[PDB]
Amino acid sequence: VTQTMGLDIQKVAGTWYSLAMAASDISLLDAQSAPLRVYVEELKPTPEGDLEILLQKWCAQKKIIAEKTKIPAVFKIDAENKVLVLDTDYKKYLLFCLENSSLACQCLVRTPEVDDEALEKFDKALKALPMHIRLSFNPTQLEEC
Amino acid sequence: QTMKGLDIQKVAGTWYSLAMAASDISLLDAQSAPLRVYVEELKPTPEGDLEILLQKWCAQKKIIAEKTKIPAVFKIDALNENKVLVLDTDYKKYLLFCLENSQSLACQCLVRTPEVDDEALEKFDKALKALPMHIRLSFNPTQLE
């Protein structure tokens, strides 16, 4: 994972939609109930510079605390143990991966609009990475787990 | 976008499902999903019809397909899944086909032997560009066997 994001975590605050996901292992995403089949709902940065992720899993709310590390784009999550922010323009899309020590990556959009720019940057970032499954969602699914 | 000049006799024997993709996530995503089917054998008849032997979550399944006016297109003897389309084969290593209804679309990359092959995946990924896919899986040699 060579492309990490001068991230300013405060400017990623608000609602996001999981437009696409990918994973190194089919078992991570393939089932509705698969461990990393998680739909982001909101990023809530804390004043301390930590990141709360709100997300939905098959249809339960979960609240993940991602702790700041000495690296701006890299967060420790208390269960997977790293969030990496690969890229964001803040206003439209954010690309992140989850890894252990297991690689799963998501393309997030601010609005439930189909966004080919977001998917184009996601598909570029995945070339270097050993993905064996890739899902993309429609705007109906964006607004619906 | 079907193969020109297909000779169905030369695709006869054992195959392995290396990769799959589908227009709808729901067609592949579950282990038990409708088109999560692993090809085992192509058995062309001398009449130029096609039996496909498959495994699904592990029960044997049988697709019976009859020849049409187009060599690379077979009419499935079923009610809802309707056509097999052979997009491309070199006969000896890989074969690319789609299953469609009429329209929900599933395409597979097949290999003769249970080894990952970048040519097979490269041609599979090319043929999918033109098609409205929302999910793509690829398998490792362990999973192949």
DSSP A73-107: TEEEE----EEEEEEE-SSSEEEEEEE----EEEE
CA-wise closest residue to B137 among A51, A16, A25: A25
Supply the CATH classification number for the domain B1-145: 2.40.128.20
The experimental technique behind this entry is: X-ray
Contact: A30, B25; criterion CB under 8 Å: no
Residue-wise DSSP of chain A = --------GGGG-EE-EEEEEEESSHHHHSSTTSTT--EEEEEEE-TTS-EEEEEEE--EEEEEEEEE-SSTTEEEE----EEEEEEE-SSSEEEEEEE----EEEEEESSSS--HHHHHHHHHHHHTS--SEEEE--HHHHH--
Q: How far is it, in rounded angstroms, from Cα B36 to Cα A32?
A: 14
> B76-92 burial, b if ≥16 CB within 10 A, otherwise e?
beeeebebbbbbbbeee
Q: How far is it, in rounded angstroms, from Cα A138 to Cα A35?
A: 21
Name the residue among A30, A31, A135 with its Cβ closest to that of B134.
Answer: A135
Q: Which residues pair with A60 in a beta bridge?
A: A57
DSSP code at position B2? P
- What the block records as the tokens of B97 is 């086909």
Q: Which residues pair with B28 in a beta bridge?
A: none
CA-wise closest residue to A142 among A22, A28, A16, A37: A16
A92: alpha, beta or left, given left = phi > 0 and alpha = psi -120 to 50?
alpha
> A40-70 burial, b if ≥16 CB within 10 A, otherwise e?
bbebebeeeeebebbbbbeeeeeebebebee
Q: How many CA atoms lie within 13 A of B99 on its CB side?
A: 24
- Which chain B positions have a beta carbon within 8 Å of A138's beta carbon? 134
Contact: A135, B29; criterion CB under 8 Å: yes
Task: Please give the C-alpha separations between residue A15 and each of A51, A141, B20, in angstroms, as whole numbers.
Answer: 13, 15, 33
Contact: B134, A138; criterion CB under 8 Å: yes
Give the 3-state secondary structure of residue B144: helix
Q: What is the resolution of this structure in A?
A: 2.1
Q: How far is it, in rounded angstroms, from Cα A30 to Cα A76?
A: 25
Asked if residues B121 and B18 have their Cβ atoms less than 8 Å apart, the reply is yes
Q: Is B143 on the interface with A (CB under 8 A)?
A: yes
| Chain centre to alpha carbon of residue A15 | 12
First-to-last alpha carbon distance for chain A, in angstroms, is 28
Give the 3-state secondary structure of residue B112: coil
**Where does B90-127 show beta strands of DSSP type E?**
94-101, 105-111
CA-wise closest residue to A66 among A98, A34, A90, A36: A98
Rounded (5°) CA angle B140-B143-B145? 115
Breakpoints of chain B, after residues (C–N > 2.5 Å): 57, 102
Contact: B135, A133; criterion CB under 8 Å: yes
